[PDB]
Amino acid sequence: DHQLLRYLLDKD
Amino acid sequence: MELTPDQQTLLHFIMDSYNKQRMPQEITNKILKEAFSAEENFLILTEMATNHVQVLVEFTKKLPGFQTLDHEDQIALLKGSAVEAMFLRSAEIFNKKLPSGHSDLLEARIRNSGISDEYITPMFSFYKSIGELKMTQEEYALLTAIVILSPDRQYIKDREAVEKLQEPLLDVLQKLCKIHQPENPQHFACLLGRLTELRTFNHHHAEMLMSWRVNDHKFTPLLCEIWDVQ
Ligand SMILES: O=C(O)c1ccc(NC(=O)[C@H](C2CCCCC2)n2c(-c3ccc(-c4nccs4)cc3)nc3cc(F)c(F)cc32)cc1
């Protein structure tokens, strides 16, 4: 699972 | 032969984005300051790499077309390039000119950092090989962008969509080589060849980390996502 990468890529 | 207006715009934009990185001198000062134990060195490595991955995500999101790509393909591209990008950046840092004798001390400090000898030699061989190419900041920045946007990566669902983003960057790099290194026409092919050597470090990064001469291999939740470690 890549929760933190997913978070860093989706935010602005 | 020469860069087009669109290409000059793209190049300058990749440059602004790349210059947001931590100063090489800031990194080398931390290492050259005093001789640290293998435990203090491993802690420096994890701190440096945590910041590196954070800066890399920001550089990656500014790459033209990256945000249009499928969300799962975005993760796969980032996970597959983080390690290679830090090694590429480490070669740049290594090859930066310092006052007489300081490059010899930096080499010895890295050699004595805690990493196994089996990984020391291929690592220094790659840094040495990079330095021989006399790469400009523009070349390092484009090569980093090309490494991130590699369609030939594992778990990519739409390879065509990625190849469309990588081609203009390959085109710019090819042009820069024909201009800054005209006496060496094989320069672009040399650069592209380095990327295969980069891939070997990625294949052995987990063993490199676990073989580090420390009692505990403590990572952060972000490093566990980017590295194949627990
Ligand atoms: O852009 C940045 O912000 C940013 C900052 C730091 C670094 N890098 C580092 O700090 C580490 C130092 C080596 C000595 C011990 C501490 C870590 N580092 C490395 C190195 C070694 C091993 C690995 C791995 N093994 C397994 C998985 S990853 C990775 C790198 N090679 C280096 C060459 C240099 F000339 C240098 F000055 C530092 C170097 C790269 C990029």
mmCIF file of C-alpha atoms and ligand atoms in Angstrom:
data_model
loop_
_atom_site.group_PDB
_atom_site.id
_atom_site.type_symbol
_atom_site.label_atom_id
_atom_site.label_comp_id
_atom_site.label_asym_id
_atom_site.label_seq_id
_atom_site.Cartn_x
_atom_site.Cartn_y
_atom_site.Cartn_z
ATOM 1 C CA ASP A 1 0.000 0.000 0.000
ATOM 2 C CA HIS A 2 1.187 3.546 -0.911
ATOM 3 C CA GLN A 3 -0.948 5.848 1.266
ATOM 4 C CA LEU A 4 1.728 8.611 1.678
ATOM 5 C CA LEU A 5 2.777 8.666 -2.014
ATOM 6 C CA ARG A 6 -0.943 8.717 -3.009
ATOM 7 C CA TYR A 7 -1.381 11.646 -0.565
ATOM 8 C CA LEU A 8 1.701 13.625 -1.800
ATOM 9 C CA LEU A 9 0.594 13.188 -5.447
ATOM 10 C CA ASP A 10 -3.093 14.194 -5.025
ATOM 11 C CA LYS A 11 -2.818 17.348 -2.749
ATOM 12 C CA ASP A 12 -2.143 20.953 -4.024
ATOM 13 C CA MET B 1 20.124 21.315 -34.863
ATOM 14 C CA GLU B 2 19.364 24.257 -32.458
ATOM 15 C CA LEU B 3 16.578 24.277 -29.777
ATOM 16 C CA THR B 4 13.062 25.455 -30.853
ATOM 17 C CA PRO B 5 11.130 28.140 -28.771
ATOM 18 C CA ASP B 6 8.939 25.386 -27.164
ATOM 19 C CA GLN B 7 12.062 23.367 -26.324
ATOM 20 C CA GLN B 8 13.834 26.406 -24.739
ATOM 21 C CA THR B 9 10.637 27.063 -22.700
ATOM 22 C CA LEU B 10 10.459 23.410 -21.562
ATOM 23 C CA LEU B 11 14.217 23.319 -20.707
ATOM 24 C CA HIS B 12 13.989 26.554 -18.605
ATOM 25 C CA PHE B 13 10.899 25.244 -16.816
ATOM 26 C CA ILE B 14 12.655 21.900 -15.991
ATOM 27 C CA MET B 15 15.619 24.027 -14.733
ATOM 28 C CA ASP B 16 13.559 26.236 -12.380
ATOM 29 C CA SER B 17 11.878 23.067 -11.014
ATOM 30 C CA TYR B 18 15.260 21.239 -10.587
ATOM 31 C CA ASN B 19 16.941 24.224 -8.840
ATOM 32 C CA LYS B 20 14.391 23.802 -5.941
ATOM 33 C CA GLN B 21 16.682 20.922 -4.753
ATOM 34 C CA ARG B 22 18.841 21.089 -1.570
ATOM 35 C CA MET B 23 22.254 22.772 -2.180
ATOM 36 C CA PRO B 24 25.086 20.228 -2.972
ATOM 37 C CA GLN B 25 27.425 22.246 -0.656
ATOM 38 C CA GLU B 26 24.833 21.927 2.195
ATOM 39 C CA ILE B 27 25.003 18.067 1.768
ATOM 40 C CA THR B 28 28.862 17.823 1.456
ATOM 41 C CA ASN B 29 29.349 20.144 4.513
ATOM 42 C CA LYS B 30 27.258 17.787 6.691
ATOM 43 C CA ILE B 31 29.518 14.838 5.611
ATOM 44 C CA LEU B 32 32.927 16.695 5.609
ATOM 45 C CA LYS B 33 32.142 18.450 9.008
ATOM 46 C CA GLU B 34 33.302 15.558 11.222
ATOM 47 C CA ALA B 35 33.700 11.784 10.909
ATOM 48 C CA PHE B 36 30.457 10.171 12.086
ATOM 49 C CA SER B 37 29.859 6.589 13.264
ATOM 50 C CA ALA B 38 28.028 4.187 10.871
ATOM 51 C CA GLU B 39 24.857 4.747 13.010
ATOM 52 C CA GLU B 40 25.055 8.570 12.665
ATOM 53 C CA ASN B 41 25.712 8.099 8.880
ATOM 54 C CA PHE B 42 22.667 5.795 8.382
ATOM 55 C CA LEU B 43 20.506 8.442 10.213
ATOM 56 C CA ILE B 44 21.905 11.170 7.861
ATOM 57 C CA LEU B 45 21.064 8.855 4.856
ATOM 58 C CA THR B 46 17.403 8.394 5.961
ATOM 59 C CA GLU B 47 16.976 12.165 6.666
ATOM 60 C CA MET B 48 18.561 13.104 3.267
ATOM 61 C CA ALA B 49 16.462 10.502 1.389
ATOM 62 C CA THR B 50 13.199 11.578 3.117
ATOM 63 C CA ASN B 51 13.768 15.201 1.925
ATOM 64 C CA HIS B 52 14.966 13.951 -1.529
ATOM 65 C CA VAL B 53 11.708 11.997 -2.110
ATOM 66 C CA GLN B 54 9.621 14.998 -0.977
ATOM 67 C CA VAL B 55 11.447 17.343 -3.403
ATOM 68 C CA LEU B 56 11.209 14.634 -6.142
ATOM 69 C CA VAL B 57 7.379 14.398 -5.858
ATOM 70 C CA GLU B 58 7.139 18.217 -6.355
ATOM 71 C CA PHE B 59 9.551 18.111 -9.390
ATOM 72 C CA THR B 60 7.596 15.114 -10.805
ATOM 73 C CA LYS B 61 4.164 16.847 -10.489
ATOM 74 C CA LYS B 62 5.540 19.869 -12.465
ATOM 75 C CA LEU B 63 6.661 17.535 -15.390
ATOM 76 C CA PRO B 64 4.448 18.345 -18.432
ATOM 77 C CA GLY B 65 1.563 15.889 -18.745
ATOM 78 C CA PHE B 66 2.302 14.008 -15.492
ATOM 79 C CA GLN B 67 -0.997 15.143 -13.870
ATOM 80 C CA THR B 68 -2.992 13.799 -16.908
ATOM 81 C CA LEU B 69 -1.625 10.233 -16.313
ATOM 82 C CA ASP B 70 -3.654 7.508 -14.518
ATOM 83 C CA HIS B 71 -3.282 7.717 -10.687
ATOM 84 C CA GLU B 72 -1.903 4.145 -10.332
ATOM 85 C CA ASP B 73 0.623 4.738 -13.200
ATOM 86 C CA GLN B 74 1.754 7.948 -11.368
ATOM 87 C CA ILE B 75 2.590 5.871 -8.189
ATOM 88 C CA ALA B 76 4.338 3.156 -10.290
ATOM 89 C CA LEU B 77 6.512 5.807 -12.050
ATOM 90 C CA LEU B 78 7.477 7.443 -8.712
ATOM 91 C CA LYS B 79 8.163 4.183 -6.828
ATOM 92 C CA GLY B 80 10.312 2.919 -9.779
ATOM 93 C CA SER B 81 12.482 6.031 -10.031
ATOM 94 C CA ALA B 82 13.042 7.383 -6.481
ATOM 95 C CA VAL B 83 16.158 5.245 -5.757
ATOM 96 C CA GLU B 84 17.713 5.826 -9.244
ATOM 97 C CA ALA B 85 17.110 9.609 -8.911
ATOM 98 C CA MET B 86 18.914 9.816 -5.536
ATOM 99 C CA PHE B 87 21.921 7.852 -6.926
ATOM 100 C CA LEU B 88 21.969 10.118 -10.023
ATOM 101 C CA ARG B 89 21.837 13.176 -7.743
ATOM 102 C CA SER B 90 24.601 11.651 -5.522
ATOM 103 C CA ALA B 91 26.858 11.334 -8.640
ATOM 104 C CA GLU B 92 26.216 15.056 -9.428
ATOM 105 C CA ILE B 93 27.038 16.031 -5.778
ATOM 106 C CA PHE B 94 30.166 13.773 -5.828
ATOM 107 C CA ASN B 95 31.512 15.350 -9.043
ATOM 108 C CA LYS B 96 31.063 19.012 -7.893
ATOM 109 C CA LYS B 97 34.443 20.797 -7.558
ATOM 110 C CA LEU B 98 35.588 21.525 -3.974
ATOM 111 C CA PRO B 99 38.853 23.076 -2.528
ATOM 112 C CA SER B 100 42.012 20.886 -3.044
ATOM 113 C CA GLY B 101 41.943 17.619 -1.043
ATOM 114 C CA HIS B 102 38.231 17.885 -0.007
ATOM 115 C CA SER B 103 37.036 15.498 -2.813
ATOM 116 C CA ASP B 104 39.503 12.839 -1.546
ATOM 117 C CA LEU B 105 38.173 13.310 2.062
ATOM 118 C CA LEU B 106 34.525 13.148 0.863
ATOM 119 C CA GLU B 107 35.294 9.838 -0.969
ATOM 120 C CA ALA B 108 36.956 8.353 2.187
ATOM 121 C CA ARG B 109 34.017 9.511 4.404
ATOM 122 C CA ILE B 110 31.478 7.792 2.066
ATOM 123 C CA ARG B 111 33.708 4.650 1.860
ATOM 124 C CA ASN B 112 33.652 4.505 5.722
ATOM 125 C CA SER B 113 29.910 5.317 6.122
ATOM 126 C CA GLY B 114 28.763 1.765 7.046
ATOM 127 C CA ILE B 115 27.885 0.465 3.550
ATOM 128 C CA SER B 116 29.318 -3.015 2.513
ATOM 129 C CA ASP B 117 32.459 -3.176 0.303
ATOM 130 C CA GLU B 118 30.544 -5.220 -2.357
ATOM 131 C CA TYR B 119 28.394 -2.091 -2.998
ATOM 132 C CA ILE B 120 31.191 0.533 -2.489
ATOM 133 C CA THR B 121 33.161 -0.279 -5.708
ATOM 134 C CA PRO B 122 30.164 -0.411 -8.217
ATOM 135 C CA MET B 123 28.888 2.839 -6.560
ATOM 136 C CA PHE B 124 32.255 4.679 -7.008
ATOM 137 C CA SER B 125 32.638 3.154 -10.506
ATOM 138 C CA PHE B 126 29.278 4.753 -11.479
ATOM 139 C CA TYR B 127 30.144 8.165 -9.901
ATOM 140 C CA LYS B 128 33.573 8.133 -11.656
ATOM 141 C CA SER B 129 31.904 7.206 -14.997
ATOM 142 C CA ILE B 130 29.390 10.103 -14.579
ATOM 143 C CA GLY B 131 32.185 12.617 -13.791
ATOM 144 C CA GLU B 132 34.055 11.639 -16.989
ATOM 145 C CA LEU B 133 30.991 12.802 -19.018
ATOM 146 C CA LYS B 134 31.375 16.440 -17.708
ATOM 147 C CA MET B 135 27.551 16.857 -17.463
ATOM 148 C CA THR B 136 25.991 20.319 -17.125
ATOM 149 C CA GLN B 137 23.108 21.114 -14.694
ATOM 150 C CA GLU B 138 20.705 20.994 -17.742
ATOM 151 C CA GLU B 139 21.851 17.441 -18.578
ATOM 152 C CA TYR B 140 21.394 16.215 -14.938
ATOM 153 C CA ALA B 141 17.885 17.798 -14.788
ATOM 154 C CA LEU B 142 16.747 16.277 -18.109
ATOM 155 C CA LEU B 143 18.248 12.868 -17.320
ATOM 156 C CA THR B 144 16.330 12.956 -13.954
ATOM 157 C CA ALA B 145 13.080 13.822 -15.843
ATOM 158 C CA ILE B 146 13.768 10.997 -18.376
ATOM 159 C CA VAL B 147 14.404 8.474 -15.478
ATOM 160 C CA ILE B 148 11.035 9.421 -13.848
ATOM 161 C CA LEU B 149 9.122 9.166 -17.132
ATOM 162 C CA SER B 150 10.462 5.722 -18.105
ATOM 163 C CA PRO B 151 7.644 3.726 -19.885
ATOM 164 C CA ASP B 152 9.821 0.556 -19.624
ATOM 165 C CA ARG B 153 8.927 0.451 -15.860
ATOM 166 C CA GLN B 154 7.133 -2.356 -14.049
ATOM 167 C CA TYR B 155 3.354 -2.037 -13.274
ATOM 168 C CA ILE B 156 2.694 0.596 -16.008
ATOM 169 C CA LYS B 157 -0.812 0.047 -17.476
ATOM 170 C CA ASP B 158 -0.597 2.652 -20.317
ATOM 171 C CA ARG B 159 3.008 2.710 -21.653
ATOM 172 C CA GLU B 160 2.033 4.834 -24.733
ATOM 173 C CA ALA B 161 0.781 7.746 -22.512
ATOM 174 C CA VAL B 162 4.217 7.815 -20.692
ATOM 175 C CA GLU B 163 6.296 7.459 -23.905
ATOM 176 C CA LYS B 164 4.445 10.538 -25.240
ATOM 177 C CA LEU B 165 5.718 12.518 -22.201
ATOM 178 C CA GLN B 166 9.311 11.157 -22.355
ATOM 179 C CA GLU B 167 9.976 11.770 -26.145
ATOM 180 C CA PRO B 168 10.151 15.663 -26.078
ATOM 181 C CA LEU B 169 12.626 15.428 -23.131
ATOM 182 C CA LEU B 170 14.765 12.870 -25.034
ATOM 183 C CA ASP B 171 14.665 15.302 -28.031
ATOM 184 C CA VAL B 172 15.931 18.266 -25.900
ATOM 185 C CA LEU B 173 18.725 16.174 -24.306
ATOM 186 C CA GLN B 174 19.872 14.889 -27.725
ATOM 187 C CA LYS B 175 20.026 18.556 -28.915
ATOM 188 C CA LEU B 176 22.039 19.774 -25.839
ATOM 189 C CA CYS B 177 24.632 17.006 -26.391
ATOM 190 C CA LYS B 178 25.127 17.956 -30.102
ATOM 191 C CA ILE B 179 25.827 21.573 -28.917
ATOM 192 C CA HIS B 180 27.920 21.312 -25.663
ATOM 193 C CA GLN B 181 29.888 18.192 -26.669
ATOM 194 C CA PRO B 182 30.392 18.446 -30.516
ATOM 195 C CA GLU B 183 33.860 16.745 -30.381
ATOM 196 C CA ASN B 184 32.106 13.622 -28.872
ATOM 197 C CA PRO B 185 29.121 12.578 -31.115
ATOM 198 C CA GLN B 186 28.441 9.479 -28.968
ATOM 199 C CA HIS B 187 27.717 11.705 -25.853
ATOM 200 C CA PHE B 188 23.884 11.257 -25.948
ATOM 201 C CA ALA B 189 24.235 7.435 -26.352
ATOM 202 C CA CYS B 190 26.788 7.474 -23.418
ATOM 203 C CA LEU B 191 24.207 9.306 -21.208
ATOM 204 C CA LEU B 192 21.399 6.893 -22.129
ATOM 205 C CA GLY B 193 23.741 3.974 -21.315
ATOM 206 C CA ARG B 194 24.234 5.306 -17.728
ATOM 207 C CA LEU B 195 20.503 4.678 -17.080
ATOM 208 C CA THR B 196 21.082 0.877 -17.384
ATOM 209 C CA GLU B 197 23.795 1.150 -14.690
ATOM 210 C CA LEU B 198 21.337 3.187 -12.588
ATOM 211 C CA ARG B 199 18.809 0.323 -12.783
ATOM 212 C CA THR B 200 21.344 -2.128 -11.127
ATOM 213 C CA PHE B 201 21.488 0.071 -7.921
ATOM 214 C CA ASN B 202 17.690 -0.009 -7.798
ATOM 215 C CA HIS B 203 17.750 -3.852 -8.071
ATOM 216 C CA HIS B 204 20.198 -4.039 -5.065
ATOM 217 C CA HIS B 205 18.998 -1.060 -2.944
ATOM 218 C CA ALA B 206 17.241 -3.230 -0.274
ATOM 219 C CA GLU B 207 20.366 -5.434 0.293
ATOM 220 C CA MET B 208 22.510 -2.231 0.332
ATOM 221 C CA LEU B 209 20.317 -0.807 3.143
ATOM 222 C CA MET B 210 20.074 -4.034 5.168
ATOM 223 C CA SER B 211 23.846 -4.792 4.862
ATOM 224 C CA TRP B 212 24.657 -1.350 6.364
ATOM 225 C CA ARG B 213 26.898 -1.832 9.449
ATOM 226 C CA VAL B 214 24.326 -0.642 12.058
ATOM 227 C CA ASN B 215 22.550 -2.439 14.960
ATOM 228 C CA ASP B 216 19.066 -1.217 13.888
ATOM 229 C CA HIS B 217 17.828 -0.255 10.411
ATOM 230 C CA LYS B 218 15.198 2.311 11.395
ATOM 231 C CA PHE B 219 13.139 3.782 8.521
ATOM 232 C CA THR B 220 10.257 6.286 8.249
ATOM 233 C CA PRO B 221 6.753 5.355 6.874
ATOM 234 C CA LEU B 222 7.527 7.327 3.673
ATOM 235 C CA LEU B 223 10.857 5.471 3.138
ATOM 236 C CA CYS B 224 9.025 2.111 3.586
ATOM 237 C CA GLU B 225 6.777 3.133 0.615
ATOM 238 C CA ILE B 226 9.721 4.126 -1.649
ATOM 239 C CA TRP B 227 12.228 1.408 -0.566
ATOM 240 C CA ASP B 228 11.528 -2.343 -0.362
ATOM 241 C CA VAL B 229 12.134 -2.339 3.447
ATOM 242 C CA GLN B 230 10.210 -3.039 6.726
HETATM 243 O O1 LIG C 1 19.206 15.748 -3.453
HETATM 244 C C1 LIG C 1 19.365 15.562 -2.172
HETATM 245 O O2 LIG C 1 18.785 16.229 -1.327
HETATM 246 C C2 LIG C 1 20.318 14.454 -1.789
HETATM 247 C C3 LIG C 1 20.895 14.427 -0.517
HETATM 248 C C4 LIG C 1 21.766 13.414 -0.161
HETATM 249 C C5 LIG C 1 22.089 12.406 -1.068
HETATM 250 N N1 LIG C 1 22.978 11.351 -0.693
HETATM 251 C C6 LIG C 1 23.485 11.141 0.544
HETATM 252 O O3 LIG C 1 23.247 11.854 1.518
HETATM 253 C C7 LIG C 1 24.401 9.918 0.667
HETATM 254 C C8 LIG C 1 25.209 9.916 1.979
HETATM 255 C C9 LIG C 1 26.472 9.009 1.876
HETATM 256 C C10 LIG C 1 27.286 9.011 3.182
HETATM 257 C C11 LIG C 1 26.429 8.588 4.370
HETATM 258 C C12 LIG C 1 25.172 9.469 4.482
HETATM 259 C C13 LIG C 1 24.362 9.459 3.165
HETATM 260 N N2 LIG C 1 25.283 9.767 -0.519
HETATM 261 C C14 LIG C 1 25.346 8.650 -1.331
HETATM 262 C C15 LIG C 1 24.478 7.468 -1.185
HETATM 263 C C16 LIG C 1 24.895 6.206 -0.744
HETATM 264 C C17 LIG C 1 23.983 5.156 -0.650
HETATM 265 C C18 LIG C 1 22.639 5.344 -0.996
HETATM 266 C C19 LIG C 1 21.637 4.230 -0.892
HETATM 267 N N3 LIG C 1 21.940 3.003 -0.566
HETATM 268 C C20 LIG C 1 20.804 2.220 -0.553
HETATM 269 C C21 LIG C 1 19.655 2.840 -0.862
HETATM 270 S S1 LIG C 1 19.952 4.494 -1.194
HETATM 271 C C22 LIG C 1 22.230 6.603 -1.433
HETATM 272 C C23 LIG C 1 23.132 7.646 -1.532
HETATM 273 N N4 LIG C 1 26.234 8.775 -2.288
HETATM 274 C C24 LIG C 1 26.815 10.048 -2.083
HETATM 275 C C25 LIG C 1 27.817 10.710 -2.793
HETATM 276 C C26 LIG C 1 28.186 11.963 -2.352
HETATM 277 F F1 LIG C 1 29.155 12.634 -3.007
HETATM 278 C C27 LIG C 1 27.595 12.554 -1.249
HETATM 279 F F2 LIG C 1 27.998 13.784 -0.861
HETATM 280 C C28 LIG C 1 26.611 11.923 -0.543
HETATM 281 C C29 LIG C 1 26.237 10.665 -0.989
HETATM 282 C C30 LIG C 1 21.511 12.423 -2.338
HETATM 283 C C31 LIG C 1 20.641 13.438 -2.691
#
